[PDB]
Design a protein around this ligand. Structure first.
Ligand code: IMP
Ligand code: IMP
Ligand code: IMP
Ligand code: IMP
Ligand code: K
Ligand code: K
Lengths: 365, 365, 365, 50
């Protein structure tokens, strides 16, 4: 009679959550060469990228240099809002103002690099949004930790009613089906997914609130796909296989954090420790970033070098996944099968019982 | 109505995958003494080996010396293809040219040692295949990472059409029932199973594509057994118990990698570090081997000595398993029962809370 | 249509196995003080012990001194058979020949201590059994690794017909319901359960054959309880909680290995290393003991002191469990219920986030 | 050369010749390198007592 996990209510424990490490992609009938796979994906309803990657709107990840590098690499960049409005407008103008070196670069009709800007909620946020629209940004990301709030939905509706025909609107982070449906009703052009899985996040420990990324993406897609609203998986990605898994679950774009923190094109200066090169990386809710219960931490990540090499490694991993699953395009990769694995399967997936003597470019010891 | 793991599609997560560490063999009513067990099994539809083990077609594992030693021990070796065609034909001839020391040695109708050769897919691959068939090879392995490709199936069909009655053709690695069925339709005499579980493989991390080995073997056997096509489990084997589990899942032969890399007959030079002996071991998709998005790593494995001792230890483990399950032959072992175990059972299986003071021959720290 | 774990046969993976670390005992309505709990249980159909613990028939655990100490403490000992027949008969006589100090001591009708002896399978085993019976042993354990063999059943039946009215017969190790039923029908007076879980056993690694101990005990009890044949859980016990769980699963007696190997009454010289004390402990299938594929290891265990202290600690833990479950007797403990835990619950069970400064007498680091 | 210059007519060699192939003793292997045993006539082993 009672639920096997306790109590009398079968809906107290709603579901079982899968993360990236819980699943693998099943090989299928393939006629696709990895080098001929088209990796174009809809970032929003009206924007298409050549490489479905986006830089995180974090103070140690994305600024004008990183935004330019990402737009040239074929993706896009979202500028962080941990700075005054005038400076952010200057960054937007700098990005918009900047031949054959980058065939995959993302540009508008006026031939200038695309860029995105992150805004909060409030009348101050309204002023910032209007200033950034005047500065000519292409997409505004309403950035909130919990986007199922009434205020966030009202802000999204206001922005769409005001500057809808000019810029695109991307909703704050969600983790359920109802939240995604509410964001789509409000009129958001894209839905960003993830609450907890950030590499520097401590929401699941401090507050005990979170959701595994694969299940959250599946639910959000089940809510957004009938209306054609793209999904951006945000946070939790460590390898290119994770990107492939996120895209195969239904997410149209992936937003990268610590994978782009150690690049040269990122803000922040180099740090030397025992002859090794590291760079700082902190969450936007960290104790320093707030300058109060922090919801993030501070740390250092190894230096990685030029952004082009990292983006090419990630794209190569995605192309290999597409070749394995027989996916000509991302839209076909979004219908690939999944297989769940156990902890033993997890340690079988990684290299095992071998003393790695030299690092691979796409896999770090 | 919604799937407990998210979404509305019940087939999005196809199945739960079991690896070697997830299962154990159930003891059964036995009348078999381990010393009198018959370990012979079919490699292809026409070749039967006295010991159901095959060396991997890797440049650090199998060459003429290892192939000759494996053929003498009762198994077989497969020469790799990371070298020019003329040299590979020379290795084939060297093996074929080379009485009571090895009663279990595998020989053809002329009394010459059996040996196999690995080829790719393409026109140069076809030239290599014709050269090797002229050189006198016994089995040709169409060795590809993803064998459900239309080109690989066409290559297998061409090889069977041309030289089908002289040599046998073994298909590339598959991981699903559909791929094994496609290979069987294409005319393959044996199906090789496994995508990901290699000790040096990084496909499941770089691309996020893979499948646990026990489930893959079960599915491929379900596809192949009604048509009498043998199955060769490739990758992931670390102990003799793993070999017994693979053969119990339905596989007719096991292909060994890192277990044969530390032997004397394997190519490579001995390495001394801090009083200990190792040998290099690299995957055929590693950056060192491809000369880029590599799909392998490089490392070192401890030195284990002569091949015959290792083969005897593995065969003793297999005979112990056959005696435990009451299996007179491998075909009777292929119907043994499995019990699924958890991580706590996983640590209980290995020795626990004991300070091992001397290494056993078949269990290494 | 297909099985979720692979293939078309739902009985290929027969069941899910639970070990000691996967379950906990559920508290129930209790009117039992831990001091008034009756810990007596049946060893065989005609022999009742005051303490349901038995020493292992190993050459590093039980000899005359250990057998005498165990019989004095309220349990029993089983003399190993890795020595000539005359020496074993001498050990039996030494135990028999050997007052308020030990009021719980187990004695036969004549007032002499009880002892058990281990015999193999064969004609030499028959001669050894006859010599031991002449020497006056009370219980013969047909000690085999796999007791579902036809020879083991024949030996048990022959011994039961020969000296069944003078001694009791205990069957070798089983792990399935069918094996226990076969042993019971063969006429065994007690059934010993366990294949793999020994702390020095490598069968699950070498042969890949085994069964988790809780599930094996449950199956064997389901086979044996209707006929009133007791069950002895052998191997895998590390704490008094494990003893309580084993008895609650249906086992009537527990056989202890490494928990008694480091005591003062165990054979062997005390070994000093780094200012601390250890004693040798090796499996009967280890290469050192066999003097050929080994299925055991050698090692050292920390010195623990007199046997009486260890037995008192174990009995205190068992009495605490009996008080928690409200079990006046062991037969009432054999009906307590279990709760299945996960890995997180497993690490919650042990002490966590605390630096232990002094070792508790019953909980060891 | 220095010893002969000081006035010595002949030099007697010890460890300079111990490792040669013509010296008695079994060749020993350590870390893949080759070494040979050398001990003094007053060593504890050679005596077989300060
Ligand atoms: O301080 C923080 N707390 C919680 N989430 C954060 C914080 N800073 C950034 N995030 C989010 O977590 C993601 C981390 O990305 P990752 O490093 O790729 O996992 C970012 O892209 C943001 O969406
Ligand atoms: O670089 C590589 N990537 C992926 N698979 C590989 C690579 N090199 C070899 N393999 C396969 O993986 C297997 C590994 O076997 P193992 O060393 O026994 O785990 C080999 O026998 C090959 O079939
Ligand atoms: O070499 C061996 N291999 C396998 N089982 C063994 C061996 N020696 C003893 N055993 C059994 O395994 C048990 C181990 O007890 P434990 O150390 O308390 O787990 C012994 O009591 C025997 O029943
Ligand atoms: O045990 C010993 N103690 C002291 N001198 C020794 C001993 N054995 C040999 N010698 C002398 O020391 C010399 C060592 O030569 P060297 O190896 O060139 O230094 C020998 O040639 C002997 O003359
Ligand atoms: K792997
Ligand atoms: K064990």
């Amino acid at each position: 009679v009672p639920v096997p996990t306790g109590g009398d209510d079968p809906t107290k424990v709603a579901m079982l959550g899968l993360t990236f490490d819980d699943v693998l992609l099943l090989p299928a009938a393939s006629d696709v060469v990895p080098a001929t796979a088209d990796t174009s994906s809809q970032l929003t309803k009206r924007i298409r990228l050549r490489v479905p990657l986006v830089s995180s709107a974090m103070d140690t990840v994305t600024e004008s240099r990183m935004a330019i590098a990402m737009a040239r690499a074929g993706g896009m960049g979202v500028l962080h809002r941990n700075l005054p409005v005038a400076e952010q407008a200057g960054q937007v103008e700098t990005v918009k103002r900047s031949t054959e070196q980058f065939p995959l670069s993302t540009k508008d009709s006026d031939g200038r690099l695309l860029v995105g800007a992150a805004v909060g909620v409030g009348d101050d946020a309204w002023t910032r949004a209007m200033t950034l629209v005047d500065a000519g940004v292409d997409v505004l990301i309403v950035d909130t930790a919990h986007a199922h709030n009434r205020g966030v939905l009202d802000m999204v509706s206001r922005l769409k009613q005001a500057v809808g025909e000019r810029v695109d609107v991307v909703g704050g982070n969600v983790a359920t089906r109802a939240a995604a449906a509410a964001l789509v009703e409000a009129g958001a052009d894209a839905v960003k997914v993830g609450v907890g899985p950030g590499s520097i996040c401590t929401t699941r420990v401090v507050a005990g609130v979170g959701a595994p990324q694969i299940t959250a993406i599946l639910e959000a897609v089940a809510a957004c796909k009938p209306y054609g609203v793209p999904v951006i998986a945000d946070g939790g990605l460590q390898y290119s296989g994770d990107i492939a898994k996120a895209l195969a679950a239904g997410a149209s774009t992936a937003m990268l954090g610590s994978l782009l923190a150690g690049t040269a094109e990122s803000p922040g200066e180099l740090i030397f420790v025992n002859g090794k090169q590291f760079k700082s990386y902190r969450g936007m809710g960290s104790l320093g970033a707030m300058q109060l219960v922090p919801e993030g931490i501070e740390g250092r990540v190894p230096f990685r070098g030029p952004l082009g090499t990292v983006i090419h490694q990630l794209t190569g991993g995605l192309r290999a996944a597409m070749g394995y699953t027989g996916s000509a395009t991302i839209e076909q990769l979004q219908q690939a099968q999944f297989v769940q694995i156990t902890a033993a399967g997890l340690k079988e997936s990684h290299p095992h019982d071998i003393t790695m003597t030299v690092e691979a470019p796409n896999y770090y010891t």
